[PDB]
Design a protein around this nucleic acid. Structure first.
Lengths: 129, 218, 88
RNA sequence: CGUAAAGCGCACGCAGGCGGUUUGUUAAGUCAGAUGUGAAAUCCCCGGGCUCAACCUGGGAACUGCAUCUGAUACUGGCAAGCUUGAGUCUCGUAGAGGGGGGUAGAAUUCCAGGUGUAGCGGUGAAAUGCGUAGAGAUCUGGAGGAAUACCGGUGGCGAAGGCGGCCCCCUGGACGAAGACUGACGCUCAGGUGCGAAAGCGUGGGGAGCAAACAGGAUUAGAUACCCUGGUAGUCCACGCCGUAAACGAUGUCGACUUGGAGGUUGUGCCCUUGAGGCGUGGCUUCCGGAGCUAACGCGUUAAGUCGACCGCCUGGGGAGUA
């Protein structure tokens, strides 16, 4: 059954980048809009738009720089089978800083740079490389 | 809008999903190319193709299917340019080396043919040698006066002439193809969504291309 | 499965009204009705191992719904299994 | 983990693991800080003393931990309330070798009785054993009995898998479709457990036409405990119980999501002059070929062996050995 909708979202974006898809729709939630706002903020997607009233639908307009795709490798880190909670010192950098890692901290859903600057660790959701 | 008078697209069968941006696609099981997309594409091809034609470059029209012949001989030869109209030999660009000595044999045998010793010593071997000039003349026809490997390539069907596109992509030569809805934009640098097998369409089409080639600095 | 008149009678007895035909008590009572009727069928035959697989789906599904309704409202649970004579 | 070792034969399901979506509260996990502790030596860093080094030594860092207190509340969990996109119920139909019980029908084989009729029949590569003037084989009539159900029949259908094929009745399971209503996360997987599970086999009682392990004879052969021939018992068939396995195989666990196409098959449904054996869609199941991608390759390829998530099962060189 669906047991990880975040990894489902990242699957939608990997398979949309891999199929030269212009835009990606999915069911929407607060955590997916938080992550999507981080992805737009860090420049991996072009835009997002949440529509619907009773059944919201998140839509990510994807990016393609050259013919190549911008989101090179998006991975889900803290899956439901095994959750991964890092401190502010254990908090990893991806592609030696060239690629953010979306961590859910108590202050909100941030990146690794932003939460290492904020001085607080948390639950590391996904590597975007 | 309407430079492309009469073709409106073709190929019901074996259509290629990579041609999905170029298809209007309605009537009677056959696909219609969006010619409102073709006209900017084809004007771009005339732009860069005239740009390399003005730099004193060699263009190499490719016309193996019928009746692209003698329309590619007429259009290439209306310019001071080159062509392949019969079977495109596998590797006349990527080993042009060996094809250079076959062209050399064509030159030596026509010089031997219409001027030198053609009636000399045999009738049978002379007939043999003349039909070697028919075979080397129709295979290495247009390219025989090139002397380099060309600065662009203009193919008239992308799937029927996939070999030449594959080699010009192998060598870094700009490929200018009129694709149809069955073809694939492989490494065609300047794709043109058109109609590959209508003689009206390819004579209009090569008419425009041969028109823009023969404007250099003049 | 069951008769249209029988299903309508059980929906009328256990639902808030008719058209409330998906409530948990109603589904439980319809499964119960069919389980008892097929007790009569499988006392005979006894080697209808295919139909029995359908029956064990009914038993298991009834069990799931009783577990749901037990951990939602226990008063509805006790009234329900009191009325249907199940649980032994 | 298709083919190298490796997916339980298939399901149901307890404990376990995981769990759609919104709001509020808590703050257990999680995070931040503080305090107490984490002995000294040792490791590490910056210095100092032995002529240097090993060695000794000063200060720090570290000891990745635990406990308590103070906070943060995004995610996970607890609690309360919901919501429908998951799951399920109801209405109406559809197709089907799905299952169990009962009945019946027609061809054919064998046997029995009788008519005609006469010298072979059967069999094989060739033969012989075998049957036959006590009248076979062929042929016609009548009867008995058992098993299986030609044609339809189709990479057709149904079933979880094993599997299910005349026709009719009775009892019964599931699937799919159309519109609408209802419940409201009731879900997914599943170790142990339980059930179903071809064929052969076993037990008790029937039945026994054909076929046929064993067995016997004839050949073949160097031999022939075989292949071939002529017979032929258990068995195959029924009732009930056992067994519990197969190359139980798509050698591919289950459930869910996403990702270019083409040609079919089968079963629904909606719309349009139905102006016909049409045109346009929209579902369910299924076959062949192929794109990206993956793959050791072969190939798989929207029914994945692609891109992911949940849970389970299993593998760790060959043999010995799936044996003691």
């Amino acid at each position: 059954s669906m047991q990880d909708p975040i990894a489902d979202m990242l699957t939608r974006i990997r398979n949309g980048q891999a199929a030269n898809k212009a835009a990606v729709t999915m069911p929407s939630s607060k955590l997916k809009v938080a992550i999507a706002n981080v992805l737009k903020e860090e420049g991996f997607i072009e835009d997002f738009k949440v529509e619907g009233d009773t059944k919201p639908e998140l839509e990510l307009t994807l990016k393609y720089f050259q013919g190549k795709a911008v989101v090179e490798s998006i991975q889900r880190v803290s899956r439901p089978g095994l959750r991964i909670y890092k401190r502010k010192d254990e908090l990893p950098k991806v592609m030696a800083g060239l690629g953010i890692a979306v961590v859910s901290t108590s202050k909100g859903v941030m990146t690794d740079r932003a939460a290492r600057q904020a001085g607080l660790g948390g639950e590391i959701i996904c590597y975007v490389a | 809008m309407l430079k492309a008078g009469v073709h409106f697209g073709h190929q019901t069968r074996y259509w290629n999903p990579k041609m999905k941006p170029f298809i209007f696609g309605a009537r009677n099981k056959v696909h219609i190319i969006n010619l409102e997309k073709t006209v900017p594409m084809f004007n771009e091809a005339l732009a860069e193709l005239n740009k390399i034609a003005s730099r004193k470059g060699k263009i190499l029209f490719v016309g193996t299917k019928r009746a692209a012949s003698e329309a590619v001989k007429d259009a290439a030869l209306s310019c001071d340019q080159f062509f392949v109209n019969h079977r495109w030999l596998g590797g006349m660009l990527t080993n042009w080396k060996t094809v250079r000595q076959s062209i050399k044999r064509l030159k030596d045998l026509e010089t031997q043919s219409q001027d030198g010793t053609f009636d000399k010593l045999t009738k049978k071997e002379a007939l043999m040698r003349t039909r070697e000039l028919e075979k080397l003349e129709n295979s290495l026809g247009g390219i025989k006066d090139m002397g380099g490997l060309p600065d662009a390539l203009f193919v008239i069907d992308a799937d029927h002439e996939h070999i030449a596109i594959k080699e010009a992509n192998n060598l870094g030569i700009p490929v200018f193809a009129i694709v149809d809805t069955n073809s694939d934009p492989d490494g065609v640098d300047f794709v043109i969504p058109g109609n590959d097998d209508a003689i009206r369409a390819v004579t209009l089409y090569l008419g425009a291309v041969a028109a823009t080639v023969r404007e250099g600095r003049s | 499965s069951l008769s249209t008149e029988a299903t309508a009678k059980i929906v009328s007895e256990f639902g808030r009204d008719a058209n409330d035909t998906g409530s948990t008590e109603v589904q439980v009572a319809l499964l119960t009705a069919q389980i008892n009727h097929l007790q009569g069928h499988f006392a005979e035959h006894k080697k209808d191992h295919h139909s029995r697989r359908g029956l064990l789906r009914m038993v298991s599904q009834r069990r799931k719904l009783l577990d749901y309704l037990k951990r939602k409202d226990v008063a509805r649970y006790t009234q329900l299994i009191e009325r249907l004579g199940l649980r032994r």
